[PDB]
């Protein structure tokens, strides 16, 4: 289908607890493929996918160099932000960013993205023109005028419209083994009585790799909602995921309800019921 590349960037001041920490994580289609980190004291836990070591140290030490120059920029960013908000030097603050590109089935760029946050709050973002900015407050308004005067949107756009989509197609081809993995969930239904009048049906999905999945309870083939509770998809720890979905059925009518599972790894969506 349609693909995405994003870098997630994090830069945190640590006055006294050492010095600033910098993290840059890269994602293809929400698959982590590279991780840079100022705290990492061995490249064993600066992980990268196989098809990144495939590129040699002439794409590690270049990106390591970019990362290291990027942190000089992030260093000033954090100092300027302290000034814009008249913050003290003893406080810890967090600058974050997400940027990247969306491409279609072929590679027609569809949209570019770049946005920032300061201490968890939207700060500034590149509009979909890739030519103009939305500021969140007076701090970001200051940032916007300087980036208007320095013509930053044009350089961001050049990266997003150029380097971004052209490196993404390379990644999509070179890591397609790793990237479209797709292990299907193993599913079962459990039953939990509460009243004499009532129980709860819990539909389990376990061990599916692409974290996207949809679970749905339905009564006589009709989708249900608020009597249906959904737990947030969680990692299992073995590069796979878990999820479940519960509904409170009235005791005796259990065989009315059916759980529908949809996931990339399934030939067809599954239907399950409680089996006593």
């Amino acid at each position: 289908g349609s693909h995405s590349m994003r870098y997630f960037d994090t830069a945190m001041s640590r006055p006294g607890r050492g010095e600033p920490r910098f993290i840059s994580v890269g994602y293809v289609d929400d698959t982590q493929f590279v991780r840079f980190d100022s705290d990492a004291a061995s490249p064993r836990m600066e992980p990268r996918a196989p098809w990144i070591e495939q590129e040699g140290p002439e794409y590690w030490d270049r990106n390591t160099q970019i990362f290291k120059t990027n942190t000089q920029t992030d260093r000033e960013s954090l100092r300027n932000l302290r000034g814009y908000y008249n913050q003290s030097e003893a406080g810890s603050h967090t600058l974050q960013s997400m940027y990247g590109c969306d491409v279609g089935p072929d590679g027609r760029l569809l949209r570019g993205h770049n946005q920032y946050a300061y201490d968890g709050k939207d700060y500034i973002a590149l509009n979909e023109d890739l030519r103009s900015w939305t500021a969140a407050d007076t701090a970001a308004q200051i940032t916007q005028r300087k980036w208007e005067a320095a013509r930053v949107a044009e350089q961001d756009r050049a990266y997003l419209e150029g380097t971004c989509v052209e490196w993404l197609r390379r990644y999509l081809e070179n890591g397609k083994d790793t990237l479209e993995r797709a292990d299907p969930p193993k599913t079962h239904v459990t039953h939990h009585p509460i009243s004499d009048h009532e129980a709860t049906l819990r539909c389990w999905a376990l061990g599916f790799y692409p974290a996207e999945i949809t679970l749905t309870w339905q009564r006589d083939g009709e989708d249900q909602t608020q009597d249906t509770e959904l737990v947030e998809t969680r990692p299992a720890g073995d590069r796979t995921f878990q999820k479940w979905a519960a509904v409170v059925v009235p005791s005796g009518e259990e065989q009315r309800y059916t759980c529908h599972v949809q996931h990339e790894g399934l030939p067809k969506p599954l239907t399950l019921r409680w089996e006593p």
């Binding site: 840059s24 890269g26 990106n63 990027n70 000033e76 960013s77 980036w147 930053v152």
Partner: peptide, 9 residues
């Protein structure tokens, strides 16, 4: 690949 980022906030 990483964006080269030169302009501070």
């Amino acid at each position: 690949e990483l964006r080269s980022r030169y302009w501070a906030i």
